[PDB]
Design a binder for this molecule. Structure first.
Ligand SMILES: Cc1cc2c3c(c1C)C(C)(C)C[C@@H](CCc1c(F)c(F)c(F)c(F)c1F)[n+]3c1c(=O)[nH]c(=O)[nH]c1[n+]2C[C@H](O)[C@H](O)[C@H](O)COP(=O)(O)O
Ligand SMILES: Cc1cc2c3c(c1C)C(C)(C)C[C@@H](CCc1c(F)c(F)c(F)c(F)c1F)[n+]3c1c(=O)[nH]c(=O)[nH]c1[n+]2C[C@H](O)[C@H](O)[C@H](O)COP(=O)(O)O
Ligand SMILES: [K+]
Ligand SMILES: [K+]
Ligand SMILES: [K+]
Ligand SMILES: [K+]
Ligand SMILES: [Mn+2]
Ligand SMILES: [Mn+2]
Lengths: 500, 500
């Protein structure tokens, strides 16, 4: 099966790419696996595959860390992500986000039901597993539990059957047959949970599939629209119908090649202690435990030699930056265009801990609007900060066409030099806030509301007659023929490869 | 003579350090010298010495570019700066700024007058030079003139004789015997000019010395206090009295080893076209010419084989970042401490185009103050933004003790995650603004007033009981013995030098 359609094949692809380190000696799931993975993420090293995990029994489980993190080289920086999508490993961010948006104006391709698959090779009922005995990692030393779920896909369906959502949300082991996890507004798992709670008749049928098709985990991490079944979006993106098997204990359908599947229910009534979890902004607040959603596990099914993917998340750079930030930015780009705003590109700078999104403006279109900074900032912020796709983002930075928003250095240059603090900004206090950011939930104001800003780094003439500067840089402050001469004589004169 | 006391010896030191490229074939001062230098600055390469400058006659002049820019390696990143000060080339930023502040609580060491020096080896009177015939560089293609003065020291004295100021301010050739340049409030050259204008009797006696002692050009770039003669500050810093010769045509005194000296007057009445100049923020606004100060040159004296230093300034990284930003930050650190504020360190992040300063707070002292963010931000901003040392800085970022302000990545992490936009900030509209920043002079509001902010990236418990998080990073989320194990097995397992 192709890498983008089968996690096992994706692991092969990483090896083949010389982008894997297989570690065949014993590694402790208590912190050691995650510490190695953290080091990988902070240095852009090869992804670690832990084949000998202390406490692995009955095939459960090996671990792959850093599945969506960065490679060291510029040329294939995003290659792990490209490998989730059948793209060349040299794909740019623009090309990856375009691929992730491509299904938004295609008919869905619904999934195909098949009678069995590798995820049925082994099973454990209600009397044979114990989640506390599996080699579930402790990812950060102050975490409030062992976070089994950092890169699997939750599957829940609306009561009426019309929407099946796939998404990533964290969960940790509570006891032998339960997890606790985050289920928070406006996320689709929470929206579906609310529908079941209002019906009031039963717990939510649920499955959690680990090691799913890579193209599926990418859509799981993207805020595609309300009511859109991710499986059909992924089908359209990839040009093929995904193959799903039925769960044994419920009528949900999981990818046929899933490494590990949990089947059970998400309670509409019960909660249990959850967190703290070291995460995306780079913090853990020891002891900050709160009641979370509670999941009951009734059955485990799994591949022979199952592999659990893991995100050792925190400070730069991991899946929480490369996938959450970038995919939100992609959706924001589209949302802006659908609202008739002249946005060409969007990216969440890593330097902002993916709390900002830079929006590149087609300033010829802006000029034709005949507007002003105050008005345009208000319009952009009203569209983005009132939509789910903007939930995690607290600062929008508007920049003109000379800025490559995929280059954080250029975003920072524009922000620092073109946006006058206060005057060129509009604060938004009456919008949903993201409580996970430390200055929100652990800050001075309401955890759930406000704290957002649009920062206009467009210069005044960009609204009127056009850019009226040139950069004081080698590119823009010297004629072409001189630049080329300098370059051609560089090593000759005595000064100091694209792949590397 | 030592490198820090003699520019010629400093050039030697750079060679010796393998930090110079001598270019002995013809180079055009019209853009080519500056384009090579710009490329050096954008890549942290070796400093260029142009020994064969098209239009060099009668010994005037060779050019050294990038005298204060960065080296490529981390270990000696600031070595060029360290070479201005007799510090080891591995000196940290903290050590360089401490050296620059050290004379602030020492008695001055006044300069020593000597009868002659190398700067007297050659001379040209009022009938023998023509500034338009010298090989003065065109530094950026859209500059409004040929900027002879980017790294020399202006020397002016108060009418009463009690204060002699040394400072860098740009100047360009106006005609055969005049320059025009920036002379703007609150700069000391402007403050002294105002004193002469109020006396009303004569133009200001002036000299401009190029290729001065490196320790002197560093003080020239620092906002030491009003009324303090830089020569005595530099004497105290270096532990030696600087040797000065008298000018031939006035009673000012110049460093004995100056490469090139212009003698003349700064008019109290006349002005001429000046600018635009590609500069520190990274921009040139073509055609943005305005009346500047006008200097008359009566005499040139110069060393045999004179060398003119040049800053090809603009986008990162050059003297306008490494010296202007860092030295302002140093002075701000001291100012805060003298106002009883618990600041331990200050630095202007390069990523902000040196428009921000990050202030590291001793949070044990903060806790004892028993204050709040609003109050503390107001206090800090009132001290800094009402003082000349704060003139160029538009955003102050307050951070706690875990942050290394000399590391821009850590400043950006703290700013993005600990400061809630709006709520955790105080805007200052009734302070002097720096008009050179594009969002000021080319922005939406008053060029000279406001646009400043204090951004509090202290978390709430840092005011009360102490830090209540740990970073989700390899350093803080794993015990010591595990970290060390991981490190010791890193290459063993299959993953990938301090000087490199
Ligand atoms: C890639 C990834 C995504 C994570 C995610 C993780 C990863 C690795 C970790 C498990 C390592 C960390 C956490 C990050 C948490 C977090 C977010 F990052 C986030 F963006 C949210 F909007 C959010 F509500 C949130 F809680 N995790 C969650 C989560 O727990 N709950 C959440 O609610 N979301 C989480 N997301 C983000 C979601 O997958 C996306 O927002 C996605 O758009 C949700 O799908 P849908 O609701 O169908 O649009
Ligand atoms: C290192 C350096 C310093 C430059 C400076 C340059 C360099 C390379 C360039 C010539 C390349 C560019 C320009 C930068 C300009 C500029 C500034 F950078 C600045 F910080 C100022 F406060 C300012 F008013 C200003 F205009 N230059 C000037 C200047 O023209 N006028 C100016 O008025 N100052 C300029 N400074 C900065 C000053 O040297 C310092 O602010 C110093 O503190 C002034 O001395 P004093 O007035 O005695 O405190
Ligand atoms: K999703
Ligand atoms: K602006
Ligand atoms: K000075
Ligand atoms: K704060
Ligand atoms: Mn969804
Ligand atoms: Mn001074």
């Amino acid at each position: 099966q192709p890498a983008h359609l089968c996690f096992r094949s994706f692991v092969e692809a990483l090896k083949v790419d010389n982008d894997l380190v297989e570690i065949n000696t014993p590694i402790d799931p208590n912190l050691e696996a995650a510490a190695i993975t953290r080091r990988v993420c902070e240095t852009n090293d090869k992804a670690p595959l832990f084949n000998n995990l202390i406490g692995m029994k009955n095939g459960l489980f090996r671990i792959l860390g850093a599945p969506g993190s960065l490679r060291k080289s510029s040329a294939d920086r995003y290659g792990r992500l490209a490998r989730h999508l059948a793209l060349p490993p040299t794909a740019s961010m623009r090309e990856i986000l375009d691929k992730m948006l491509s299904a938004s104006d295609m008919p869905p391709i619904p999934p195909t039901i098949v009678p069995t698959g590798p995820c049925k090779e082994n099973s454990l009922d209600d009397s044979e597993f114990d989640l506390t005995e599996l080699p579930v990692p402790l990812i950060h030393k102050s975490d409030g539990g062992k976070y089994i779920q950092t890169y699997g896909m939750h599957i829940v369906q609306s009561p009426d059957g019309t929407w099946t959502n796939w998404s990533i949300a964290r969960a940790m082991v509570h006891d032998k047959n339960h997890l606790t996890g985050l289920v928070i507004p406006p996320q689709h798992i929470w929206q579906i949970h609310q529908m079941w709670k209002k019906e009031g008749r039963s717990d939510v049928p649920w499955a959690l599939a680990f090691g799913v098709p890579p193209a599926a985990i990418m859509a799981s991490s993207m805020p595609i629209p309300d009511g859109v079944t991710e499986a059909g979006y992924v089908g359209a993106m990839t040009g093929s119908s995904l193959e799903l098997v039925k769960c044994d204990t419920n009528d949900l359908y999981v990818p046929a090649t899933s490494e590990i599947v949990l089947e059970g229910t998400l309670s509409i009534s019960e909660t249990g202690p959850e967190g703290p979890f070291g995460q995306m902004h780079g913090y853990i607040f020891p002891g900050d435990t709160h009641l979370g959603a509670k999941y009951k596990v009734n059955r485990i099914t799994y591949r022979n030699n199952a592999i659990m993917p893991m995100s050792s998340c925190g400070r730069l750079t991991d899946e929480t930056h490369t996938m959450i930030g970038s995919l939100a930015a992609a959706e924001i780009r589209k949302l802006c265009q659908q609202n008739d705003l002249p946005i060409t590109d969007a990216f969440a700078p890593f330097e902002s801990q993916v709390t900002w999104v830079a929006l590149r403006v087609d300033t010829e279109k802006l000029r034709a609007m005949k507007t002003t900074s105050e008005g345009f900032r208000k319009r952009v912020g009203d569209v983005v900060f009132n939509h789910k796709a903007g939930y995690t983002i607290h600062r929008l930075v508007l920049v003109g066409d000379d800025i490559d928003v995929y280059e954080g250095k250029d975003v920072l240059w524009a922000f620092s030099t073109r946006c006058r603090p206060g005057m060129d900004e509009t604060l938004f206090e009456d919008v949903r806030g993201f409580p996970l950011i430390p200055y929100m939930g652990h800050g001075n104001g309401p955890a759930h509301r406000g704290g957002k800003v649009v920062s206009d780094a467009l210069m005044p003439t960009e609204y009127t007659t056009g850019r009226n500067w040139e950069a004081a840089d080698f590119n823009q402050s010297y004629p072409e023929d001189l630049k080329q001469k300098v370059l051609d004589n560089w090593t000759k004169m005595g000064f100091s490869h694209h792949h590397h």
